[PDB]
Amino acid sequence: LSIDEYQGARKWCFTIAFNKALVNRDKNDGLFVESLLRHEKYSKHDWYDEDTRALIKCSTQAANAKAEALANYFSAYRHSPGCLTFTAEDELRTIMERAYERAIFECRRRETEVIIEFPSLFEGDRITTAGVVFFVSFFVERRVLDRLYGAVSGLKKNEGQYKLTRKALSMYCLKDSRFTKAWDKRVLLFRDILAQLGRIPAEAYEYYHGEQGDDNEGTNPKRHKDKFIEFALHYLEAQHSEICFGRRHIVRKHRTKGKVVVDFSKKDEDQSYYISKNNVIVRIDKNAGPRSYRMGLNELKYLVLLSLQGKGDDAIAKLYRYRQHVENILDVVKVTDKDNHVFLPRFVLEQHGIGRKAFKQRIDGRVKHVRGVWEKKKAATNEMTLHEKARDILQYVNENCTRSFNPGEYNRLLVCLVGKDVENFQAGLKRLQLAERIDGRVYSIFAQTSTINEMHQVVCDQILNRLCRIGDQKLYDYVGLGKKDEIDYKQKVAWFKEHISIRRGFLRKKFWYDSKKGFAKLVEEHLESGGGQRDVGLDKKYYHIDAIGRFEGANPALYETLARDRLCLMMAQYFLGSVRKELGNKIVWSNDSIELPVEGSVGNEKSIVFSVSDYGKLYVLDDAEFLGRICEYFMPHEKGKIRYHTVYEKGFRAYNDLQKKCVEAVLAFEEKVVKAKKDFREILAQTMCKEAEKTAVNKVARAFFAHHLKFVIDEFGLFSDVMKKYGIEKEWKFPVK
RNA sequence: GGAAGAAGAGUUUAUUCAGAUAGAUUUGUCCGGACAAAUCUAUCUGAAUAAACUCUUCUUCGCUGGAGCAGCCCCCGAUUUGUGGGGUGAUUACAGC
């Protein structure tokens, strides 16, 4: 349809389409892959062949150059004549044919019409408008593609074949609706954190909804375990760069047996952190060299809280200093003061003579503790599990035996005891008695008993009797105070220097010195003031018990579980608000919404409102200051909180209607001035207008070209009058619109 | 009616997503017309993360010496997890039979 003849001002609608394609490419380069993989990525089956899939995956970043080249040719009448023609040798021409064939086959699966072939062929090296619209189908949304499919293109003419042509070209296009990116890591963290935070604590579930006898996870779940540490470590890694915690892996007498090794490699996703009784290992790498420490939960929660206030990084610096200070103390142990005294462990201080304890007090402390443990075990006979009882009974036999039991023999005896086959135990005792490994007294005392409870009671009686016997050196041997020390001091000091740990409560004294408030008050004040502006979904019924006294009962536990849980809430926000880099810092959270405030008047009413799903990067979303500008210049009357859909449906239409009429006029002016005269603002430079006015007109043109507006108000009037000078005038009602 | 760890097989519970099917509202295109987007309300498939519950296979379950600056427990107080004072015959970033 005179595709080559179509030139000059008669064809300008492609210009804005390619300008939009450029800004879409700037937002995301992967849109090409997404459009090519629309039906396969989130679905079970792929109609693409393996070779076609390999071609699509390998073909990346080359197509955008071709798109940019075509945009330049369509943009200007002056230059770039040979861009349109392309060789059939190109692989892009192969993948286009494959995709078009698959799409037309899918449309033919609709068996309504097969009579007429849909035209999409490119004649030899040249490409028709069908090829151009098919190519620009990628990188754009549905509505712009429909507008370009309008009467501007000659294909729009309605026939019986028209509907199938509309479907085939639009097959690989993406709707301007959300199409939210959902497989990102941060979103999958946020959803699970919220879901787990919506669960009943165990202790409160035991009573409030507690049943006299006890569905399960069915209706109102119970959180069996707490996962505060896993989320806190993820947040700490995400926020800062230096910190990377240790991780554990498994790979492969007591020789060459597989033993877990703590390593700091981040290559494998399967690696899980190393937490054993609420201890972690941290790495601080900066400046001269790496360093490391181990920390408890108490110093972890304070740092996690400190980061959110915005002072976190400085705190990390203090950790870097800590080790050095300890070194100084090791030189001045005798000289230094009490504050440095609390830093060093016991054995270091004991050598200098400080903290020595009398032997008799040690004996008295040890013996009563051991006797209390053993008398508790006596009352706990039936309650304990078989695993504990078997070890308890075997301990007496192994202690009585003169020769240390072989590790291999231990397992079979443990299996025999746990199997309730006490006869095998008796047989083993008889076998060991003959060689005299074990005393015959144990065999005599064990023979009568027939149940594990009876044997446990017998053993407890013997242990209590032997503890009851008068003081002797055998008592010291049995309690373990008799052992001597044969290791030099220097090796122990070297080991201690190799392995250091942080004092408990170190962070709290440094900054919150004057504070009288506890943990909960400190969390709650920042939650109310800094802008959490939310509370956990659970009612205060579960987190407190009214009947029992406040201090009495299990209430001291739950009152803390709330105080930490609030912190978790804030962390979840950081995993969603950080999706966008440009905005997301000015964003303010409020009651399950996300609001972006625009000052405007001194009274703030120009705020815009997103939902959680809307903030997920739909194609409609953009940068920050452009929103304020489009609100200022267009639709001034509306005030108050505005749903983003209203701005989307109002401002963008006015912007497009203005821009099309502006660009067509400027192109016509360029053509006319080029004809009258007989790139890079050469015409505007030729104009007798002032250089400031040249800058104004080219700035106004390039602003509408780049889809962002930053020009001042006065420039548009100058552009209007200079355009009027050439004799072509049209009114767009831009100001006070 | 043994305990932890690993590999594997599943099972069902609650939130998200993609492609399709209807209803209302609303906007803009064409010579009253269909169409094109959107926001809510129901329908059908499929996919991913999390929690719990079964089954199969395997692996380890000892003794000696140093460490309690870290993790646990009792006194003493408290809108509560405290650089207030006393224990823990060791839980291990470890070394030897």
Residue numbers in the entry: 14 to 227, 233 to 270, 281 to 706, 717 to 775
What does the paper say about this structure?
The CRISPR-Cas13 system is an RNA-guided ribonuclease with a single Cas13 protein effector and a CRISPR RNA (crRNA). Upon proper target RNA binding and pairing with the spacer segment of the crRNA, the Higher Eukaryotes and Prokaryotes Nucleotide-binding (HEPN) nuclease domains within Cas13 are activated to cleave the bound RNA in cis (on-target cleavage activity) and any surrounding non-specific single-strand RNA (ssRNA) in trans (collateral activity). Herein, we report detailed biochemical and structural characterizations of a compact Cas13 (Cas13bt3) suitable for adeno-associated virus delivery. Distinct from many other Cas13 systems, Cas13bt3 cleaves the target and other nonspecific RNA at internal “UC” sites and is activated in a target length-dependent manner.
To understand the structural basis of Cas13bt3 activation, we attempted to capture Cas13bt3 in a fully activated state with the catalytically inactive Cas13bt3 (dCas13bt3, R84A/H89A/R739A/H744A), crRNA and a 30 nt target. To stabilize the ternary complex, we designed a hairpin substrate by connecting the crRNA and target RNA with a 6 nt (CUUCUU) linker to stabilize the ternary complex. 3D auto refinement yielded a final map at 3.5 Å, with the core of the complex approaching 3 Å. The structure of Cas13bt3-hpRNA ternary complex with the 30 bp duplex (from here on characterized as Cas13bt3Act, the true active state according to our biochemical assays,) appears as a bilobed architecture with recognition (REC) and nuclease (NUC) lobes on two ends of the spacer/target duplex RNA (dsRNA). In contrast to previous LbuCas13a20 and EsCas13d21 structures, there is no direct contact between the REC and NUC lobes in Cas13bt3. Instead, the REC and NUC lobes are connected by two IDLs (inter-domain linkers): IDL1 (residues 183-215) is between the HEPN1 and Helical1 domains, interacting with the spacer/target duplex; IDL2 (residues 607-614) locates near the HEPN active site and bridges Helical1 and HEPN2 domains. With the REC lobe aligned, the mass center of the NUC lobe in Cas13bt3Act moves ~40 Å and 20 Å and rotates 34 and 19 degrees relative to those in Cas13btBin and Cas13btInt, respectively. Besides the rigid-body movement of HEPN domains, there are drastic conformational changes in IDL1 and IDL2. First, the IDL1 loop is dragged away from the REC lobe by HEPN1 movement to form new contacts with the spacer/target RNA duplex (discussed below). Second, the IDL2 loop undergoes large-scale structural transition relative to that in Cas13bt3Bin and Cas13bt3Int towards the HEPN active site, allowing the HEPN2 domain to move as a rigid body together with the HEPN1 domain. Patch1 was only formed upon the long target RNA binding, and the R608, K609, K194, and K645 in Patch1 translocated 5.6, 4.7, 11 and 15 Å compared to corresponding residues in Cas13bt3Int.
